[model samples]
Target: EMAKPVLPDLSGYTTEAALKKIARNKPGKITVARMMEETGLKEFIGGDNKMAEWVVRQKGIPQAIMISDGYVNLQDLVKKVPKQFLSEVSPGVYVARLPILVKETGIFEIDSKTKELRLSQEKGSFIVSEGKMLITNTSVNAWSETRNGLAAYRTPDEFRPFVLTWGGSQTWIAKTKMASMGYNQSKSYGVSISQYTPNTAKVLKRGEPTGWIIDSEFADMWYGFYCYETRDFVVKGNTYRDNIVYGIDPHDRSHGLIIAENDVYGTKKKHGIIISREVDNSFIFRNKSHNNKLSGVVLDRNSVGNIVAYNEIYQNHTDGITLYESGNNLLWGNRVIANRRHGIRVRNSVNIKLYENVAMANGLMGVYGHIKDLNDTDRDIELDPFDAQVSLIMVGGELSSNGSGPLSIDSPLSVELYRVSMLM
Candidate 1:
């Protein structure tokens, strides 16, 4: 999902007042709104109360705190924490109590022998960069040494840790394992390789080649991989499961991304793999996306000039493949099957090319195309302009055993069918 920043800054707020008030406070006592107002953090509290929920939580703050939620600076926190908490564990290997920001000649490496790194949620620890962080044959997870490194998560909104690299950074995550990363927060979403925002991008070294993530594995992620304004990043041979949001979500103005040979499944809330909002000149090929709660794969919100080829999208709760408000994309040699909704559904998109696809056994139409007005929807109209149109060309596809129909069209702007079969 492409979004503006969600968290408010309480950087200059008096954390001292709250710390003193909650000195004898109970643990897990996050609902204390009275303490928030008394501590001057009440002004930072949104209508959602999320500010107090994350920052004012008694356990979330340290006495010499490392709360890096735009509340505390990383450089300051690193200095404040004890050396044992943020020191080199072994020669050239390090463990940290605060979020590690790799920027300005920064380099971090975690090889097989080091084996594992766990960043803390309570201490607001994460790994984010505008530098270089390469992890090979190792594992990274979200846990607190303070809490015995075993925490229970009952919901998707809990404060969990994540990894990110922004604008001109390099992150090569090869043969690595990432677990229990991300929650319902922006930038904190799991494994994101992004270009920094307008303010942040203008000051940095952007427009360079971002890095690749190959031969890696992910579990319990909010978003397995996300990007904004990314360029030419290769994501290959990754396996992701049990994620809260989209398994692989590349969003907004990204180009030449190669999402290849990944097995993405068991997404609890959304599409297994998706790209949105003008993500152009990218590729999604040789991927297996199945058993997801939503569509297996999707191109959403005006994303154009992309190729989705040689993929298996199956057994999802919704459509196998969907294009919503995105146009001028090609779906070639894909197997779209066994989804609860349409196998290949097109909505308000045009110039869609369906070549040599097999769309079979879906609960709804194998190929469904329609047009609708999205002007009244929740879409950010300023960011993504929508057109009420649908156009497509279908050639050499097998559409069979669909519950609704083999093919259906409604208010389409144009359609072309050549050598499309009713059954295999």
Candidate 2:
């Protein structure tokens, strides 16, 4: 005989009236089982529930309070609310006045037709660590330092109700906002997908979650949009400035990325746009990255098979474009100009090609090359056989006024230059 399905009481899960009715009893608390029962979420008992719990335990919720017997504080869980705004309406029931963190599982969307939603964290941090959040025409402000705005990550724990595959697909976030976000350098970010703790990369080939961030403005955070170990990401038509680190950073083994048509500047710490840690097969084009503390565009830490083209890279603290320990890349039609250091720098790399780039008025050489590790402050030379055997080709370009000279090649490898005009 087939077993009948136990339906959940979802009447109390969606509306304010029903939620209040559920909390009408004294000693208000909501057990996970009860919420699951009411929501009629069948997957919550399967691998989906295990993965969800695992994510929470790894990263933890910012303001969630779990009671002694291990139940969620229902008084505060009725709706999203900040800890400061929480008030005990009755002896044991609580309510809040501020916009709380969005922590619901399943598909959550804020569409264009709805009024713009404003999420603010005046004194502390706010996070969205679980579920897919589709935020359209929304704003998040982190007025305080070190406060995170929107983030996704999992915790370090064992899965419950063990299953072969983790439930749910990669979490999704598609956002387009009108206004710009605020600052918090210690840990704040406009939108971020942090380092996933588990070894899901081994299980999933494409990597966890494909993120899309478009037509948005971000300022005064550690990162405008940061992702670590995520794959197949796209960042387009966004303006990022005054950040503590890179404007758009895809770090640590991320792949299949597209970064285009973005304006990045005023980075107080590092490059305007950077793809770090062996991120491969990426495309970066038609972007403007200028006036940063470091390089405008950087391919660092052995990244490969990437394309950088049609970018206006200028007026940065260091090189306009730099490749450090990265190879098999192409840079073409890029306007590299007026940087504090070289317009283009290739350090300890191999198999690089540059074409039709205009490099001008830089403080140092228009194009610089070195076989030494740039990150090493001691200027120590590296004698690695592979990195030392460098190959470079500069097909066509204009190079001029680079302080030391039009070119500075301090390497055993010959830098082939053809059809390049020295426009001093």
> Considering every candidate listed, which one attains the maximal TM-score?
1
TM-score, cand. 1 = 0.80
TM-score of each: 0.80, 0.67
Expressed as tens digits, the lDDT of each residue in 7-41 for candidate 1 is 22223222222122111121111111222232112
Worst 10 residues of 1 by lDDT: 23-32
Counting only residues 3 or more apart in sequence or on different chains, how many pairs clash (N, Cα, C under 3 Å) in candidate 1? 0
Where model 1 places Cα greater than 4 Å from the true spot, the runs are 1-83, 87-95, 144-152
Q: Estimate the TM-score for candidate 2.
A: 0.67
lDDT of 2 by residue, 1-424 (tens): 1122222222322222212222112332222222222211222223345335423432432232212112123233444333444444444333222322323233334444433333333322233333333444444443311233232111212111100011122233234442233233312344556443445334533335554566667766556676666676767777887766668878767787878888999988889999887888888888999999999999987789888988999999999999888888888889998999999998888878888888999999998877864445643334312355556888777898778788777763767778888975
